[PDB]
């Protein structure tokens, strides 16, 4: 809501951000573009065909390469969504492998920073 109510995935309290590194790995200005799209997720307009609840509560945010494939698996943790993994994929539909990695990161975040987010945040 304050244009930055995002939380990036860490494996623990001081666990080196396992998403910021996998995000810096993303080639070139796709990083800035995806930051823009996160801002747009907090804007409330981010266009059609870009977001998809893949399976579970895991939402794929998409960008480019072939057809919207600079993919980012996140999930909504209250008002502030948590960005799990960010990855390049070629074929449509995030590989099952990457999906299952996203699910496991979701569960790990739940068991680290909490199951439901704080009362007021």
């Amino acid at each position: 809501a304050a244009m930055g109510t995002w939380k990036f995935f860490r494996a623990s309290v001081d666990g080196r951000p396992v998403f910021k590194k996998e995000f810096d790995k993303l080639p070139d200005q796709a990083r800035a573009a995806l930051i823009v799209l996160m801002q747009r997720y907090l804007v409330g307009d981010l266009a059609a065909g870009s977001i998809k609840p893949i399976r579970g509560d895991i939402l794929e945010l998409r960008w480019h390469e072939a057809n919207n494939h600079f993919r980012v698996l996140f999930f909504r943790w209250g008002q502030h969504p948590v960005a799990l993994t960010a990855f390049y994929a070629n074929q449509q539909k995030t590989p099952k492998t990457k999906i299952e990695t996203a699910l496991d990161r979701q569960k790990i975040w739940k068991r680290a920073f909490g199951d439901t987010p704080p009362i007021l945040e």
Partner: protein
């Protein structure tokens, strides 16, 4: 380990550094990369910065490290534990 016929292994440049530092008294820590070198008896008291991949871990050589590879006292990995 090393065959006893070949004797112990010390790298020549580290041996030179050590002999000159010991004969010229306490000096700066021996900045060195020769992790594979052996700690000889006349190594005591020397502080030696053994490379470990990015840092030169300081090691104060004492009597009971004689016969050990200097690289053993400079660990090369970082580990604190999963989900502490």
């Amino acid at each position: 380990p090393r065959s006893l016929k070949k004797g112990p292994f010390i790298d020549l440049h580290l041996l030179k550094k050590v002999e000159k530092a010991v004969e010229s008294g306490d000096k700066k820590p021996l900045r060195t990369w020769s992790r594979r070198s052996t700690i000889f008896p006349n190594m005591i008291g020397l502080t030696i910065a053994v490379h470990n991949g990015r840092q030169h871990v300081p090691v104060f050589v004492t009597d009971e490290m004689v016969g050990h590879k200097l690289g053993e006292f400079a660990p090369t990995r970082t580990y604190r534990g999963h989900a502490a």
